[PDB]
Structure 1
Amino acid sequence: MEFFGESWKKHLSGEFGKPYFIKLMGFVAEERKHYTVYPPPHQVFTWTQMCDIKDVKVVILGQDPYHGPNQAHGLCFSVQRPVPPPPSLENIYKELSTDIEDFVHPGHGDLSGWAKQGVLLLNAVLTVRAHQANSHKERGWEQFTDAVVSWLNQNSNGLVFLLWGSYAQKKGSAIDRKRHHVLQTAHPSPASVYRGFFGCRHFSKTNELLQKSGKKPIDWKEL
């Protein structure tokens, strides 16, 4: 029992011994000694703890973790109780309300409900220095997350990838566009949401693509 869920560890451990990862983890450790880094150590890999890797069906991809005190916890866009939904999440909920008829604001920002249904809540970069958005980009996280996306692309079928923001969209290259579905839009952050997110209907679209593939749809209200 530990940081990486068993199935994920079993399919990603090969990255552990690679120089870029040994260097990456070294960087994060040094940063944590001089600054506050989010999320906490034991929460950087929460996204491997919600469901078996062979059960992922949808992948919502973000940029990097929330950089405010105790928001980030391993699942992209999610915040544990009693932390109130951050602006980006309130925008996700707003999109969900007009996109999904029955969806109503859950009264909290914890997205474990989606994750448990097979929605991988990943960010392109997995750690961030307090108060500095995307401060840990280009340190090795992207290559690690490329490995994640790559395993899914190669070992799964009919997955729905949701790329939110320019950085997440960089993963676009790694996905067989005819073997999987890739939907891309602006980051739900207030600073960019008006660039396409509001009105993207990614949630209903995901379910329609899912149904056509013969998979049960995600119950976005199940939170």
Structure 2
Amino acid sequence: LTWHDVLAEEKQQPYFLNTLQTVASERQSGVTIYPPQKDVFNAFRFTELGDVKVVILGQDPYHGPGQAHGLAFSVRPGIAIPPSLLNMYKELENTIPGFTRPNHGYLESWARQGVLLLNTVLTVRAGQAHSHASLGWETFTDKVISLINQHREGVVFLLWGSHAQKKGAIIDKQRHHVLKAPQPSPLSAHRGFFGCNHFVLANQWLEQHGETPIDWMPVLPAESE
């Protein structure tokens, strides 16, 4: 089973097609929408259903130029590491042996290892956080989480913030492994995100089950000749 097998019907629902046509409208209305259209579903491109090991939810895509590219918390090479990802890195530096501060914020190499970096809302108007939160994306990502719960076994869910935790309440905590903490943004990171140790705990779960742990040091695409 692939995403398109299990999502094909959802993607023909009127709410879903209407979300897309509203985004397409907004893109030509005089405001800029992030991320670009070709990138909205990149979490699914980079992490197939059968390849999901760890799910990390974000909420809103970053809303500044060059930031969002379809993966929760990640930014394009060359862009400064946003505060939420810096705080994730701080927790990583404090817990994973050998980890040091990366010089970039790009997390493709996490996704290609099975880390599903799923925002619950998949578009945003430039500079206007949460501006697409009532468009239909939350219904869609509700279904996505429900389908992972149903169709996979032994996935690690890192649920950061009340919003993500609410969304993951339906997950079977016997069949899957659910870990909770506050969000890594500056408002709450020092109130429980630091010290959550989620990255080490996720890897110990995977190892428990004969899966390769995640190499959390993210890697920049290489140059070629």
| TM-score after normalising by structure 2 | 0.91
The whole-number CA distance in structure 1 between the counterparts of 2:106 and 2:66 is 13
- Percent sequence identity over matched residues? 56
CA contact (8 A) 2:106 2:218 kept: no
SS at match of 2:211: coil
CA contact (8 A) 2:57 2:158 kept: yes
The whole-number CA distance in structure 2 between the counterparts of 1:187 and 1:30 is 32
SS at match of 1:16: helix
Deviations 1:88-122 (A, max 9, x none): 11111111100112111221111011100001000
Residue 23 of structure 2: aligned partner:
28
Residue 209 of structure 2: aligned partner:
213
SS at match of 1:122: strand
Q: Give 1:222 deviation, angstroms.
A: 4.9
Structure 1 182/103 Cα, relative in aligned 2: closer, same or farther at 3 Å?
A: same
Answer yes or no: is 1:64 the counterpart of 2:51: no
Q: Give 1:152 deviation, angstroms.
A: 1.1
Tell me which of 24, 35, 40 is aligned to 2:36: 40
Residue 3 of structure 1: aligned partner:
none
Partner letter of residue 27 of structure 2?
Answer: R
Q: Give 1:175 deviation, angstroms.
A: 0.8
Residue 79 of structure 2: aligned partner:
83
Which piece of structure 1 moves more, 191-200 or 36-45? 191-200
Tell me which of 8, 13, 36 is aligned to 1:13: 8
- Structure 1 runs of 4+ with >6 Å offset: none
Residue 191 of structure 2: aligned partner:
195
Residue 168 of structure 2: aligned partner:
172
Count of aligned positions: 218
Residue 104 of structure 1: aligned partner:
100
Q: Give ranges in structure 2 of 5+ residues lacking alignment.
A: 220-225
CA contact (8 A) 1:63 1:165 kept: no
The whole-number CA distance in structure 1 between the counterparts of 2:76 and 2:100 is 18
Partner letter of residue 11 of structure 1?
Answer: V
Answer yes or no: is 1:73 the counterpart of 2:73: no
Tell me which of 122, 138, 143 is aligned to 1:142: 138
Partner letter of residue 17 of structure 1?
Answer: Q
CA contact (8 A) 2:47 2:112 kept: yes
Q: Give 1:48 deviation, angstroms.
A: 1.4
SS at match of 2:75: coil
CA contact (8 A) 1:146 1:174 kept: no
Q: Give 1:52 deviation, angstroms.
A: 2.5
Q: Give ranges in structure 1 of 5+ residues lacking alignment.
A: 1-5
CA contact (8 A) 1:124 1:167 kept: no
Q: Give 1:221 deviation, angstroms.
A: 1.9
SS at match of 1:102: coil
SS at match of 2:2: helix
CA contact (8 A) 2:61 2:68 kept: yes
CA contact (8 A) 1:161 1:181 kept: yes
The whole-number CA distance in structure 2 between the counterparts of 1:7 and 1:201 is 31
SS at match of 1:175: coil
Residue 148 of structure 2: aligned partner:
152
